[PDB]
């Protein structure tokens, strides 16, 4: 059914692979990892962050308004 | 004849010898790790644990 052997139909594609026993598991870890982390967060930060920024704003304003409301009126 | 070749050959190459290596290393790691973590814990809590003040009350 959904086993290997009849999943799709691919023609004219060549793939090259190495052994895991003769290539490094951490090939240029920091020197190529830090720029891709900055690239990924630069691609996603303007979609993710400002809702949580306004969450922090509402949280602080609600705490301040609650402590003001418990405070009496001289 | 080099040391990593013989360490692979007589310890890592056979799977039963691999498991014997893992079991003996597990026993020695238990003893050494228990000693090290106990020593770290008694040094961080120097004079606070009961065994540090057990001698005062015989």
């Amino acid at each position: 059914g959904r086993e290997f052997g009849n999943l799709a139909r691919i023609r004219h594609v060549i793939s090259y692979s190495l052994s895991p026993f003769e290539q490094r598991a951490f090939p240029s870890y920091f020197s190529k990892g830090i720029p891709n982390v900055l690239r990924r967060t630069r691609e996603r930060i303007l979609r993710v962050a400002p809702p949580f920024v306004v969450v922090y704003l509402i949280y602080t304003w609600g705490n301040q308004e609650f402590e003001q409301s418990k405070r009496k009126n001289p | 004849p080099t040391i990593p070749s013989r360490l692979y050959s007589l310890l890592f190459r056979r799977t039963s010898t691999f498991a014997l290596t893992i079991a003996v290393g597990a026993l020695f790691f238990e003893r050494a790790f228990d000693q090290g973590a106990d020593a770290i814990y008694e040094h961080i809590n120097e004079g606070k644990l009961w065994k540090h003040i057990k001698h005062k009350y015989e």
Partner: protein, 52 residues
Amino acid sequence: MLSRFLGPRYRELARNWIPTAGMWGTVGAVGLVWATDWRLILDWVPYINGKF
């Protein structure tokens, strides 16, 4: 009814598989005495005799 394995080839297979099965039995015995903390063998060993 186990008369199918009476020949030189199965004896050859047997003497091939003596050391591997013996080493697996050694692994099983060491793992059993390691997991159970059995006091018969663990008193015969130098470094592990520290908590007794």
